Paper text:
SctX proteins are secreted substrates and are essential components of type III secretion systems. The dedicated chaperone SctY escorts SctX proteins to the secretion machinery, where the hydrophobic helix at the C-terminus of SctX mediates recognition by the export apparatus. The type III secretion substrate SctX binds its chaperone at two distinct sites: (i) its α1 helix interacts with the concave groove of SctY and (ii) the two C-terminal helices α2 and α3 cover the large hydrophobic surface formed by the N-terminal TPR of the chaperone.
We co-purified and crystallized two different complexes of AscX and YscY, with the substrate truncated N-terminally to residue 30 (AscX31) or residue 48 (AscX49). As the density of chain E was poor, helices α5 and α6 of this YscY monomer were not included in the final model. Refinement stalled at high R work and R free values of 29.12% and 32.62%, respectively. The four AscX49–YscY complexes in the asymmetric unit roughly follow pseudo-222 symmetry and the C-terminal α3 helices of each AscX bind each other in a four-helix bundle. The PISA server predicts either a complex containing two tetramers of the heterodimer or one such tetramer as a stable assembly in solution. Neither was observed, as AscX49–YscY showed a dominant peak during gel filtration at the expected retention volume for a 1:1 complex. Similar to our previously published structures of YscX bound to YscY, AscX is recognized by YscY at two distinct binding interfaces: (i) the α1 helix of AscX binds to the hydrophobic groove of the TPR chaperone and (ii) the C-terminal α2 and α3 helices of the substrate cap the N-terminal TPR of YscY, thereby masking a large hydrophobic surface. Interestingly, both AscX monomers showed a bend in the α3 helix at Ala106 despite the high propensity of alanine for the formation of helices. This helix bending was not observed for the lower resolution crystal structure of the shorter AscX49–YscY construct, despite an otherwise identical structure to AscX49–YscY.
Author numbering:
A (entry chain B): 48 to 64, 68 to 119
B (entry chain A): 10 to 121
The structure:
């Protein structure tokens, strides 16, 4: 069954140890963008640009939640 | 140089894992490429990116990543399931069958 091999791949990719930050996601994201912003390689630049756009999209979500009272 | 703390490394691995669950295989590879650039020895990051490469239709790259984990971690059965899925995307169904057979042998040998 292919369904069993698909879940086995998802379990294989699931890392152990969620177990370090208790509702500290905003500060951990700010510190992550700061360390990656000083990178030069395209792997560090692409990840920095990716996290910057995620932070910009977060501002649209807060404006939508603000209009929802 | 540019170092990442163990808490920051696992937080970057968590973000790559959350993108993989949301069907964002491309974003998962980009985040985990940065993790494995600063820390190429991160074993959990390679397993997560390997599955992200499989879901991104990059079988030619996931094959070399699956063969990498076999040489550095030969006691994991999941490495052969990824190689079976990688070689299956490369059009090598004969090689993918042997990799899946080796996966069933290690998976059964670890359970009793």
């Amino acid at each position: 069954m292919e369904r069993l091999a698909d879940r086995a791949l998802l379990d294989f990719a699931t890392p152990h140890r969620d177990l370090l930050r208790p509702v500290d996601f905003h500060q951990a994201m700010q510190g992550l963008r700061s360390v990656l912003a000083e990178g030069q390689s395209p792997e560090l630049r692409a990840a920095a640009i990716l996290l910057e756009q995620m932070h910009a999209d977060e501002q649209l979500m807060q404006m939508t939640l603000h209009l929802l009272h | 140089n540019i170092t990442l703390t163990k808490r920051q490394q696992e937080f970057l691995l968590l973000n790559g894992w959350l993108q993989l669950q949301c069907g964002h295989a491309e974003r998962a590879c980009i985040l985990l490429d940065a993790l494995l650039t600063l820390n190429p020895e991160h074993l959990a990051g390679r397993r997560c990116r390997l599955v992200a490469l499989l879901n991104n239709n990059q079988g030619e790259r996931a094959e070399k990543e699956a063969q990498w984990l076999i040489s550095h971690d030969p006691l994991q059965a999941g490495n052969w399931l990824c190689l079976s899925r990688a070689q299956q995307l490369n059009g090598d169904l004969d090689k993918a069958r042997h990799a899946y057979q080796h996966y069933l042998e290690l998976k059964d040998h670890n359970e009793s």
